[PDB]
């Protein structure tokens, strides 16, 4: 179907404890494939998936070069942001940046992304047009003016429409055995008596990939949205993910409840009941 590549970047200042820590990771869909940490003994872009390991020394050198330069730029940017917000040099601050691309089944750009946050809040973002900017406040407007002057959007558009898509397609082919394999969830319902009057029904989805999934409980065919406890999808640590949905049901009424499972790894959405 559709696929994504994302690069995430976080710099965190720590005055009195050296330079801001820089950590960046790259993903294709929900698969981590590269990482760089400025606190590593010998900081370099490192492989994190089998299919990227085949890339040659030139690849790893260029990626490492880019990471080191980004860490430097982030540190200058953090200093700039202190000025823009009239802030002290004493405090710790956070600068985040994500960029990347989505491709469709035809393999052409579906959407491009490039956005920044300072201290957990949206700062500036490249719009979906890949030509204009949304600035969150008067500080970010200064950045917008600079980036409009330097035609930054045009440079990002060229990358997002070109190399981003082209290299994403390369990775999808090289990692096809895993990146293009959907693992359906293993599913079951468990029963956990709470009292004489009520029991929890917990619907499980285990060992699935990619992370996207829908788990819903119905009572008499009515969606139990307000009454369902849904945990955040969580990593198992083996590439796969886990999730559960739970409802509290009156004892004896368990058969009025059905769990519904949707995942791209399944031909048809599943319907599950508790089986005593």
């Amino acid at each position: 179907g559709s696929h994504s590549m994302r690069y995430f970047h976080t710099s965190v200042s720590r005055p009195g404890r050296g330079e801001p820590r820089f950590i960046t990771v790259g993903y294709v869909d929900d698969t981590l494939f590269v990482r760089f940490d400025s606190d590593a003994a010998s900081p370099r872009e490192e492989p994190r998936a089998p299919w990227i390991e085949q890339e040659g020394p030139e690849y790893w050198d260029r990626e490492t070069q880019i990471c080191k330069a980004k860490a430097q730029t982030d540190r200058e940017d953090l200093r700039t942001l202190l000025r823009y917000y009239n802030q002290s040099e004493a405090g710790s601050h956070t600068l985040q940046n994500m960029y990347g691309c989505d491709v469709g089944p035809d393999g052409r750009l579906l959407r491009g992304y490039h956005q920044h946050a300072y201290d957990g809040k949206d700062y500036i973002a490249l719009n979906e047009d890949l030509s204009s900017w949304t600035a969150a406040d008067t500080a970010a407007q200064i950045t917008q003016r600079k980036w409009e002057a330097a035609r930054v959007a045009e440079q990002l558009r060229a990358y997002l429409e070109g190399e981003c898509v082209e290299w994403l397609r390369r990775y999808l082919e090289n990692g096809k055995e895993t990146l293009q394999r959907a693992d359906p969830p293993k599913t079951h319902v468990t029963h956990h008596p709470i009292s004489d009057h009520e029991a929890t029904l917990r619907c499980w989805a285990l060992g699935f990939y990619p992370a996207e999934i829908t788990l819903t409980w119905q009572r008499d065919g009515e969606d139990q949205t307000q009454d369902t406890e849904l945990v955040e999808t969580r990593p198992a640590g083996d590439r796969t993910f886990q999730k559960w949905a739970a409802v509290v049901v009156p004892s004896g009424e368990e058969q009025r409840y059905t769990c519904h499972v949707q995942h791209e790894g399944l031909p048809k959405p599943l319907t599950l009941r508790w089986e005593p």
Partner: peptide, 9 residues
């Protein structure tokens, strides 16, 4: 593959 950043905030 990454984009080389050539701009500042």
């Amino acid at each position: 593959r990454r984009k080389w950043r050539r701009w500042h905030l």
